[model samples]
Target chain A: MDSAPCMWMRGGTSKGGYFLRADLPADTAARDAFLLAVMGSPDPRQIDGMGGADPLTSKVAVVSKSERPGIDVDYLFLQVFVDQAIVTDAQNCGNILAGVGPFAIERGLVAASGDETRVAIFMENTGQVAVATVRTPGGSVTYAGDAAIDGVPGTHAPIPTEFRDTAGSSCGALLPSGNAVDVVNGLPVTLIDNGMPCVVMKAADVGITGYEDRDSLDANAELKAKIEAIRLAVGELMNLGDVTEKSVPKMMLVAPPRDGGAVCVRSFIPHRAHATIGVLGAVSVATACLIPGSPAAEVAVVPEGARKTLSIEHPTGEMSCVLEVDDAGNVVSAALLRTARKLMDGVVFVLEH
Target chain B: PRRDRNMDSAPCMWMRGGTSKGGYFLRADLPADTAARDAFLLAVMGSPDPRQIDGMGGADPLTSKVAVVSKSERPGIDVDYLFLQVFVDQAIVTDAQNCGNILAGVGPFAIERGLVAASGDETRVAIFMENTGQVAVATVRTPGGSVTYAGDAAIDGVPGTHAPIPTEFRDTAGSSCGALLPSGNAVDVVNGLPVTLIDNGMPCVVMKAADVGITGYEDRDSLDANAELKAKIEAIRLAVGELMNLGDVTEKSVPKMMLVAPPRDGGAVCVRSFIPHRAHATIGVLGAVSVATACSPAAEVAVVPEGARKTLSIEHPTGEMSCVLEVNVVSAALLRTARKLMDGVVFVLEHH
Candidate 1:
């Protein structure tokens, strides 16, 4: 049986197939083809491969020992489309980043120390750096603990992930449109990029409550068209080019927090409604809430102080991210709690075509 | 900088069989004690967690399953398959019934695990269903002495085509409820509605959709959301369980309720199966067989001819499933497909 070494890991609210860079083809085209097959792309269910048939679950994390100064490992995140034969590395996935540290330790790229292991990860796609603090009690990776995240059942050891210099990481500015608020399609919106590039708007502006469930939002054709229209127009304003086929800028609909969180959001990964916001998406939303006059800020329940732990609510639950701002009002760092569990690690077989 | 933790390893193959997915293992590889085996399976599947994030389960009832296979010593049987349903959100595992979908993969698993040797272009491996004491002979595509997964066969709730695995079940009549017509009548009255109580391979109470205020052609979501309809169906199911000799099956996953309507898609009957509570996206393999058996000559709803043999296409939410029934439903046959998704050593936490 022809096979390759693979580890199935669930990082934070998402899951993906993790692999060592050296084990795959170095050629870009060949590497993508291998990944597409590994994920059973071009198929909706991905029944033939490791993918869980959803965008969040159909992801790949390529990791390798970093040679860069002070960097423990280089992590490259790839989005494998569930129904398309396409794999892209145009975006950085913060959820998958939570797994890189543990994957590094499991792959022997980094050594564990004391009760926790910190792995400096160089985000290859965006060229940003993230520090992942993993629970490593007794000098080994342990998945048993009391840290819980929304959209996932039960609790596990928390992976405290800190992202540095990610305020303008994707759009070149925290407020890409230069103004905190932008009126696209004659509706008020905020083009922000604290980490994830997004177009935040109030749900009332879109003729629906943001409190609507993910499926309801998904099935709303009129709301979907409106969101896509705003998304395409802002993609160019955010310097994201045509954006017709792009995954970003994500569409976020905001409502007042019903559960006493900072804000309630209905995020769309361009077209499909997210069951819950992504790790960095929450950071971006939390960061957006701090910016005065922004759509999120207008409806957000702000806590006192520059260093705020804002719980960004979504359809499923809330994700809290601690955003620290310097005196200049610039976000210094955004840290959130995540958890990763190594589901399976072994050689996965692929059929010869 | 090394993996120094003690992680127990066992060879396992993950496969998608007839719209369902699960881990297939040789019985010898798992623990001997039932308690230990159940715990290992729970851990391997990441149960007691709805997301099943820490294990191989796909976080659904159809996906959370295990097939314990071993070379059988019984006469004319190639392998013994014990189908275990690992609950996704609870630490409960049940072997109360047989899974014909997972049964589609048993033959290929037996051939791959060397429990049964492949023969000719197509190999037939008689499987002993340990859960129900029934026998299912699976015909798999084995060209050049190896199992083939690609072909022109297609099943609903799954994508693309795969090699058709034609399977036949013998001694399946009343395998669960002790008789094909458990109530000694082809038709029974439940809640003042006509229903056919049959158990070809699965215990089923088949009723016409109009009698239950439904079209039966409604989508799974709509049917599942009809609270009043669900209550009515549950009431009927509770009463029928005792009549079927399945004592107070309130917590059991049996006596599946199926609502039928006249076929619209050139089939014998349209079926909407409820695994007691939720509506199925597609009918279960055995549920379809049992439903089709009710549509045969002996039942009140005779969609097919009064002949000794008949092929009934049971339409479901997604598509139709064709089930062939022999005289008196002595055997039921269907065409399904199975693919080996991955073959590797799954690492699990060592049991103390």
Candidate 2:
């Protein structure tokens, strides 16, 4: 078997292999097969591949130069299961998306501009547009500056990414049910899709603290079953037909902020509790906090303004989401700071079995 | 960052050695901290999943092998080869057991990486196994001082042929147990079963298959499907592991459960190896050598042809692992075909 020239990278809080469009196969099945081997899936431990086995880490980002106007690169986000040969490209991963900016510049997909490179990206998974800025002091990607974020330690060159107006990006509408609030199993829920789709609910109604550690929440099988039921139920109302096989409508529990953050969020990417909340999941959850009658509104105490920042507290730490909310209840723009660096670049040997 | 998306890409090589495929990495490119290194490897292999669909892992224990190489300044040792195994579905990295299958490729990897100097068409490299502290001399084909993987030598497990890399093991006793024989005897009775616990480059329990109520010629599927039988074998392995002074082998993969029967084929013995849990389709390079080494000095199974104790074959799940063994000095040598499947980089998921 021959090898594909590829770069294995660690983007944002996740790490996975990145393939240029030219380096990957044209056939969908063949490409998926190669991606599977690269990540080492169909096994929970993923003992043979580069997949971290975690939902966040077991991700793949495919980058190619774009022909679309104002877009520098086209980024496809793929989520591969650690225990199965399943690769889902149904949704966008903001963390993986964060790396596309640097990867594109480093691969010469987009030319650097002075000390920074602001590259517009088309998220292939969701078809949404995002702009990313990477450090390029010497007209080359530089990862050795003084910017850092929580969850991952060590300072890095700043990479501030801005997602375009993503309202109704994934689920057709920002509020799928038309109303800001809906009752699922007699409990109030605010299902919103700002940049990512999410079902925000109150933790007290579920008989557990939203601030529970990821381990405690993941270990609670009873709670997981209940949450999955709620997610499936909310899926129907959100116009996302039967999400048992899909990974959307991220289930989140909300409570009063315990650490001075705007909201305490315990997000479950469908089943497993997220150790740290996802970037867009936080965006959607933060939007839920701003909605007047939604479930999160009762707990979040946000100041009245068009431009605002909400500190979304997760199992690990806090994720800050800054958005511009117009008077029409539209979150026009949302942005967050992330870091990305290249981990390994070379040919990845493809197995012939 | 809160959640890492990517890091600077690194360079590595993916190679196949003796039926096992693994990634070869330079110690310099990886995290200096061992825990961080392990975490990176776990991500690299896609662990905690039965099928590593998202990473470069081959899923099977044999194929999910990994080796980290570095230039050793430790006096006589030429290169340090640290073997790491990513446990399928276990989400753990293990170094307790050494993989000689991947070791066959280490010589070429080190030489190609310039960790060791190539002398002639056939370059001999001394490898210091970091896991066991054992040193092995591997003779590799470096035509024009360039390592080549193409040749006529063929092994049973893989389909095609490649250049033959012959390796000889030295200091071949008690790498794990602190002695050649763990119980101070060649044979010891555990749970009413006579088991010979010996370490000749590999720590193994030599037992008679009939003692466990079957022929030694069972296939991989049958052995793996029988959960009850596997549990029974594991119970024996655990008890013997304690006697072997290998504490808490529950998580470890060493002191493999090896069953032997009187020559079913024209060999010293018929062998079936339980790689801790799953039955190995084919025997490992070091495993066969260790079995041959144990039988050479202590004979439950007689010496090889004409009692010379030099050449022998152990019937395995697939076929036979032919080994040339020397008992006096605890030295055993075998030929394995190595292939450079792809000379490229295998990515590791760096958390930082």
Candidate 3:
């Protein structure tokens, strides 16, 4: 009676626990405690639970059949802390979003379409909607594919994803401060939220080249201290009050494009340097580069076209985000390619309290 | 048929035993043929991939082990347990080594799965370790005839404590290589370095850290970063593998290379063990026993027994492991803990 059916999946570069909403407790506090035990947080290594002890692998996705028209499923992405006894639904996870479609079909919440299935998801965390196109050869979701992504080792089936009306998914508006550029801690920055909230600035302003590896960036104490100060200050500007305990409004630094990409990026998911940018975080970064007076646009090289395929380079490799912009410089549509796979579907047993 | 179209199912219990974790399954649930069984195991573990992105594996050698348990008809044996080490980056599985860590889970697993009956407040289950042809008895706490995992047994490497599972190994002197000292010598000169090849429970090549050009006191990351040292260690392991009559262990995870130095934590010896290639965060249970036995060679700080059974504190990378050894090498016992993380039917594709 204390067990719940779950699907452990690797979506894009992140791994998470996917569960139907009805399987968990209806009360938010009871559900949070149950999830905490399942993920085994508040302890380093999470030795007794299923969590992998890393922020990227410690996540949970709650899905349910939506009653609202036009939406196939409702996905609530919960970021379970590795060493803290906390679970937050503040931000949306695009990587875990890649698995929502397949999970819905696997759980019989949605039927598989012929050849390919398109799943329209309502992100409960940020009140945003996105669509995912999964390969369904012979009316079944297929795991084999030739598509490849950075960070993860092997190739997997492609999950073509698109976001609509996600301009201010988190911070109320595309420019939360109603300004293209803002100054925080005497440093020029752009506070934007295309899908994820972010504080974008130039790496040069922080006295280091952004192209450095993750280890080098992580080992620089003074630089991290500086970035943390700026992050704390920008939280108020982005309309996220007292982000001292939050993980949102990522701290990212922009640099000139290298290796033929549009721009180079180095992100600190608020504390540690990320090996690669988050999916929606990359989308926000790419959108920042299109803003005329933003720091990212100064160093970014955008092609002259209404439909722009911008390559957002990170510490690893580049991720392509196609932006459909109108003549008025408004982002009409944002799409990218991701890959996800079903690892295991089993009943997860929680400890009897 | 709609439910059975994509995946085949198996009953399994995923548990974290000692400092490691793995899947525990009943032997009858898997294929009988070795080749087909291994293929199924590989798919279940999502092998041939570094991250194991599509399976239950945790993407590490320590977390990629599997235990197959079943009721044993042999006299005085509760269950037959076979330990298989599943490779992370390669599609390979080996029953060449007996994992003492996974053995820590076999007794509770059998009882919980109903292969063995829980007797009293404390239950003792004699396990027949098939891989090494040895018997290990596990003592579990069964308060009120139900297995209990909450206790005060503390071990290094893992975070919290649980009910103690005291495991005793019998006839493990020549578990794999036919003799405790397989080379039949206290020390053998291999690749211009004097080494001690012993197998109390697990075959290990023990050598001084200074003989290999560095102090064995280095952490796992620094030792792993030294490619030249790793190449030399592997070279010696390959030659010693045949010398120990194991024969060509290039693809095996055994004949562990241990670099020993003076005990930094007031133990008998400070050890940095290489589980074939990667450095262990801490020492393995059997490896620590072998290292403690090898401490007899060092007359300076040797563990000379004063009683019928004596305990030796073996220092490792992260912490120390206290191994109890009886006089005349009669038996070895270590206290470990096991927790059932989750139990359910795991879904896997029928075709690999």
Candidate 4:
């Protein structure tokens, strides 16, 4: 039996099971089997593993020293299904990435200088560098503060994450198909490949103003069909081939801000409508609004200068992001604030696979 | 003549399972079959009113759930459990998919009932979900030969922390149907558009929000108002359901549609999902798990691009949740693990 060292952490609004590369087996099959056993996959109740039997809690993150200069660690994200022993690493989790800095600092991967420690993270999934700034006091990462986010209750210390040149991180270019706006089946769309490929449009242009809770939005059959039409076209433009189950180039509809934010949005996360917005998705959408000629930029109120802050409003509340762009209008860095708490910390035993 | 009616008062325990809280009761307290059982549940909730005015139900969908666990007669299974979701205003009961949250309460409930022998420091209860025939193992704290429900474990979207209830599931992939990727391809073009159909905890059909002609960042209201767009997606979902061998899903529940868009800010994948019947306040943990499964290389829904395997940010109504999926490209397989939050017991009266 192989024993590995792992740390369980609460990253932003999500929790994850973190592991160091050297702790697990070098063989891929053995590693996967060990992970499955650790998470108790293929089980509805997560009987023998550390999983909570829910998607939000059933997550894993593997960390290793990065070869890239100025980057401290390489982070790989994993999603484990509760009922099935399946693991997926096709995307990035911005929420959990917030905790990477603190995790790294706590594990002695990086040393802090003052009240803040800056760690450059290489997201293995997207091949992008995300800079995380964790608060530290007296050479230790601080987990308590007064920063409050919309989704989480109460306020805590803030972990600021800054993403650099994340635009088209996966697809190679900001606009994968070289078009800021594409007319697909008579519907206008702004397709941008930033941290993630996404399609942007105005809510009014699609026949409705964006404002409603999760329930009302899902019950509208007509609205659902129109959104589907747009998503189908956007997928083709991203060169993703077919998006049947793959949630790439997400679709976002923007509206006039009602909550003192730059824009209010309703995002479709593949098959479900988000009550709130994603950290990276919001950054990508905010980046789309910054692109001068993009269709989404036409109505968006972009902040002046390459480095500016944009407030994005969703159903729950608002999220503010600071973006840094280059002279050619390419995104250089993006930052957002997040908070996390230690939910539980202990040894989780996995049955030998 | 009354025969000590109070002595037979129904026995119920309210418990916080994971992030969600619910009332647990013995199967014998309610009637057998569908209709009568539902009526009893309505009475327990003090329904037909807005606030659940009569019972312990908090009136929200998350808080109004019920779980029934009994010693299973099925071979190899230790406990038989059933979950019921009661709508606040309508007093309707839905026993659709398995509830991972409520599954946290089973072990303690079983230990208290002596269905499982208490052992050492922990008692493991093997649970059989009648809805899906899925098996789960729940390990609860037991000291002094009885169940103990106090500790310090906290979860998001809930108030307060409590004792840890370690619950694990086994052989649960394809618990709903049979295939991890029910659609047969990692990605498929439906209605001339590319989409992914992944089924793990539940069947989910994923599509890009931009392909539908709308930005992926609209608030909830505008997304629901576009009738034409919804019809098109519904048609696609129904077709995919047929392909999944579930037959026309026009009225069936299982295949749920989720819309994905790039995050406007620096987050993971922004998401909006329909529960097939309604939009969820917060994305279902099981639903997100299935969606993440589809994003893997071995997924039958869509091929996950290389270098795109890591942390996935899933946006929902309440906020965003990020899940890390561990994948092995050579074998085209993967697995994941998450934290266990809070657990406690709840007390409920019989007829009230």
Candidate 5:
């Protein structure tokens, strides 16, 4: 048996170990089985697996040398379940991408030049370029500093990730459904696809204060069902077709800011209401708020070319995102500052099949 | 036989645990039979429909949980706590594992019930968890003879504050699996993937999000939609089941999977988790505690930064939670302080 070569990296607000595709079995089934055993799934506690049993920790990323020119690596993101031994690669984690440059540099896949290294990641699922600039000291990736992000208590070095022309990465167009605002079961929604597809609305319009916590919202059976129904209907109209269990085409409810941000948002990562808004989801939501006549825009009320930081406040706190729009009124890019650290690194032993 | 009175006068008490609120009751309020208890609890929760037209259950799994606490005859234990999970639209009740958030409310509930008297400004209440057969200590404030429920205490998941429940959990490592690091290594390879299994506050398996070809920071919906990936993850969970001393978990429940990724912005560790079947709306207190335990050096997680004390920020779907762990690298030991929110008795109605 060959020892698998892997890199342990923390991307954005999460941590995951990275593996090169060549190190594992070539067959998909064999690779999956090997991965499952490593994660220790099918148990509620994930006692035998590397899974933290929460959605965030039970994750795996496979990186391969990209064939596309100028792209450093092709990355695939997987979400594994502890009790079920399941994996889903349907989404991308913007947070984890922040650590890719460091992982690449640490593995000697990419060499750092001077104080920073630029790594272009070709997101396999969406075929988009997620470029990150990581700081390097003494020719090694630096994971320490004093940059602060909201969800994190302390501060560290910033891993700045920028998504260029991220409009409609999933739904094919900036407005996937070709409408600024559409009615789903008589409820209004604004559909947009920058990095991912999202259906934005106002809490007051839905008779919700948008101030409910995750537990309260989860406990509200009627509200959840209603939200699901609306999501399903809108998903179909947006040509998404029955995304009840799936997370894309997220549902975000907006309200007046409670924390001096752009708008108070209670976003449903489809079924579960997020404790904090997703980084890319916040960017897309902020971008949608910029377009006039959209349902979310009507409620958001941000000025054009608003160089101001747009804070998308969720139940937990606020996710601050900075958006830049070109003169033609199209969003050029969205950037947010985040930091990452290497918590631990080691080899994961797997059972031989 | 006064059936209507028995139904109407059934003892029930409503109480708040951390940011969550639930109705707690004595087992004696219903028939001693477990089947009868399930039926009574179902009626109390008003299940089978989305509207919850009959009872107080909030309809979601986290909100639909029931806690049954009683005086423990076991020596050195002050109270016995059992958690019951009643699924909405189903007649089944699952009594598995401990609920850490609700556990915070237990000491106060016991003090209010007079099971343990308020000894001083801070009362130490020992709890015998029936689910995992574990003993934990909760230190609560009692200015007077009664448990105090007012102060300036705020938890991450809950809204506008109440009094803080100062709680400290001890000897909790391996509470369920018997090994602090259930897999016997801080990091192991299962089927060719690098993984870490830790059982501190909660038994959990930790892995890099990317090894399975996933970006750890994906939105919850996108991760849930990939059926193929979900199936693969389920397979991994089954393999972990055998290693953890719980039999094949393909159909059973124990252990949980959490995907960890770097924070998009600087934080401790951003995470997305599964409550076994679904993604958690927010991170569990015990789950975060378990992650903190694994990140320490004594366990296979061994991922903590070099220091005496470390603050781990766990980012969940709702927001982020911070857990401070005291690590003794010399002894390879770890300890932590958990906050207890409140306490009160829940009356159980005699009939459903």
Candidate 6:
């Protein structure tokens, strides 16, 4: 069994193994199977594989040079299952996008410019574009710095990231349910697809605060089951077809700002509480807060400015987002700051046949 | 880098020792930190998926194992053997304990990898079990300065004859669980039930199978389905773990649950072991030795047998696996077979 060369980089608070599309088989099934072997799936602990046995750590990013006129490279994000033999590409990871620029330039998919290389990415899962400015001086990728993010320890060179044309990436409508706030089974909700499709609701409506840690919220089976019920019902109305078995329609619980941020959220990436809010999750949640009739709008306290920066507080820490919303309540530009570091560069092993 | 179709692959040998199979690697080919090494092992094993469908793992306890062999840096040892037990359906890498089944093939792997020189028809090599700091002396059949995997040495469970590579563990008391009896006693009452706590090479709680209400001869599937019995056994294991000074047997794979009954097949004792949770198809090599030592309440184990070579037919779920314990030199000799399956470079794939 021959191995593939990859750079295992920690992008934002998340860890991902980066690969070039040319290094893998052209067939999707063969590529996915080989990726699963590399990550070790179907086992809850991922004990037999490279995944850290947690949803957050079990992720893959597929990258390649693109032919699209405006895009420099094509990017596909893959989420490997920790307890099943499934690798889903239903959603894009904003955190992982932080590393794609460095990965591209480091792997020679993008050319270095000045002190930082700006790699334009076409997110295939969402059909959206993202630009990542990675610090690469002297034709080599640079990783050491002090640009810090809350969730991950230490810091590295900053990878400035911005997204475009991401509104309704997964759903057909920015307010996917056609309304900012809709009553689903007597539950007030905001089904929106700003960058990532999300189901937003007030935490107080569910008899809980949105400010709970990952461990506490994870132990509350009743809360997750309740959220899932509303999520599935809203899934149909959002025109996302069927999200069952799909890791979409992100369930979000919103509240007033806790740390001088725009909003406080304890969002679930499906059924599990995310330690830090997902990169685009913050963007969508922030977008929901901007809607006049949404559940988040009732609870949010967005700062007054033409270009508003929303500091989204989560279990781990806060992720700050800068958004430009037009008079029509549509988000024009969404950007966030994240730092990434190359943890390891090695040839990872997998099954031969 | 996938140029000319030759991705940079690590050199590894896939071999079967006793009943378990695994990939053996040189220490230089791996990482220094435990965390780094585990990630590499998991990548090779294709974990987090139960079937281990994409990797070398067969998705079973016996097959999802690996051995890291290197020339010994320790004094008085030929090779350092680190046994890693990879979970079939989980993303866990537990090296807290040793695998004697995989340990049987260590000698052959070491010699074949040139970590040890062949000593005529019989090669006596001292090995250090890195997971537990125990020393295992393995004697291999190496005629004409090479390994011969075929011979007429037969063990009951594995239905094939092979050249026996006999290994002897000389001073394995408290090698793994940190204590001989763990609780500083030959016999102790655990959770209101009395039992023998011994650690010859493997740590165990050897008690009467009748105490747990069974004939000590149940099959693997029957015992695995018994949830109530499994719970009671777990309670005792967890409790006994604290008594043996081993913290939280809940996650640890040590202090196996052993059930004993009067010998029905003219052996020392008929045994059924809970290899942590489920019943093992056959008693592990070190586990079988622990049962024998536990049955005979010995304190300082001084395998100082006033004698030399002797055999103990340790009965298990299917059949008996015999081994000779030398009370003479604080050692025991066990016969086993190993065959090299394939020589290839196990690929390393990128994680996204």
Give the top-scoring candidate (lDDT).
3
Top TM-score hit: 3
Off by over 4 Å in 4: A1-3, A44-48, B1-352
Error of 4 at B166 (Å): 19
Find the 10 residues in a row with the least total lDDT in model 4 chain B.
Answer: B329-338
Question: Judged by DockQ cut-offs, is candidate 1 incorrect, acceptable, medium or high?
Answer: acceptable
Question: Looking at candidate 6, what is the lDDT of residue B231?
Answer: 87
Model 3, span A186-217: residue lDDT tens: 98999999999999999999999899999999
Q: Rate the local accuracy (lDDT) of all candidates.
A: 0.84, 0.78, 0.85, 0.68, 0.67, 0.76
lDDT minimum window of 10 residues, candidate 3 chain B = B296-305
- Which ranges of candidate 6 are over 4 A from the true structure? A148-151, A213-216, A219-226, A326-329, B1-70, B73-78, B81-126, B130-134, B137-199, B202-288, B292-352
Ranking, DockQ, top scorer first: 3, 1, 2, 6, 4, 5
Model 1 is docked with a DockQ of 0.33
Candidate 2 - CAPRI tier? incorrect
Q: Tell me the deviation in Å of residue A322 in model 5.
A: 1.8
What does candidate 2's lDDT look like per residue over B1-352, in tens digits? 2112333334578777676777888989888898887777776665655555435565566667789999988777889999998877776788877888899889999999999888989999999999889898899999999887777887776654678898888877888787888888777878887888888778888787778777767778987887866777788888887789888788777778888777766776778788878788778777787787666222665545554447787778677878877556556888886666445545544455
Query: Residue B258's C-alpha lDDT in candidate 3?
Result: 84
Query: What is the alpha-carbon lDDT for the whole of candidate 6?
Result: 0.76
Q: Which tens-of-lDDT digit does each residue in B1-352 have in candidate 5?
A: 2011222324444455654445555655555788877776775564443433234444455556677888888989998888787777677788876777667667877887788989988788988878877666777778876666555666665433445665556666777886777777768767677777777767777776776788767667887886765676677788888787667777765577877777655557777777676777667767777766655222332334556767666767667776666663211111222222111212223442
The TM-score values for the models, in the order shown, are 0.84, 0.71, 0.85, 0.53, 0.51, 0.67
Question: How big is the positional error of residue A51 in model 3, measured in Å on the Cα after superposition?
Answer: 1.5
Model 6, C-alpha of B309: deviation from truth (Å): 13
iRMSD, model 2, in Å: 8.1
For each prediction, how big is the interface RMSD?
2.9, 8.1, 2.9, 17.3, 24.0, 11.4
DockQ of each: 0.33, 0.17, 0.34, 0.02, 0.01, 0.08
Q: Give the best candidate by DockQ.
A: 3
For residues A211-262, write the lDDT of model 2, one tens digit per residue.
Answer: 7778898899988887888888877778888899888889989999999889
The lowest-lDDT stretch of 10 consecutive residues in candidate 5 chain A is A1-10
